[PDB]
């Protein structure tokens, strides 16, 4: 909840529209550190709902607790690790 809250909310839509570019959307960098969506014409901005439809996120205590429990069972934890690699940088999320 402290390290990363509300960071999986920036995917790359089309230029001046509300349609996501890629079929399996992934977050951009929060502030110019992680993934940069570089296509012909694209830009990413806040407004996305979330990776798994909003279920998988650390922007609430219940959501964070459910995601932590999911990651402990060793089922779909690399997905969250990769989503943090995309949203945040690349050296902090691997420790968590």
């Amino acid at each position: 909840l402290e390290l990363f809250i509300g960071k999986m909310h920036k995917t790359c839509f089309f230029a001046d529209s509300d349609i996501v570019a890629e079929e399996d959307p992934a977050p951009c960098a929060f502030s110019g550190n992680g993934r940069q969506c570089t296509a012909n014409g694209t830009e990413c901005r806040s407004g996305w709902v979330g990776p798994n439809g909003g279920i998988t996120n650390f922007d609430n205590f219940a959501f964070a607790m459910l995601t932590v429990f999911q990651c402990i069972t060793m089922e779909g934890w690399t997905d969250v690790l990769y989503w943090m690699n995309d949203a945040m940088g690349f050296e902090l999320p691997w420790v968590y």
Partner: protein, 48 residues
């Protein structure tokens, strides 16, 4: 009969009939893709 919400694809791990419910429960018991079934169960009652 509550996984018919996507309107673009058909779900295979459902609770439609008794054999499919048994297979889904067994799959969750083995732990493989239990979170995928949980996400569908949550989205069937609204969402996040």
């Amino acid at each position: 009969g509550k996984f018919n919400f996507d309107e673009t694809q058909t779900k295979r791990s459902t609770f439609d009939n008794f054999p499919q419910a048994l297979l889904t429960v067994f799959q969750i018991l083995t732990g493989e893709d239990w979170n995928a079934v949980m996400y569908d169960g949550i989205m069937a009652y609204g969402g996040p």
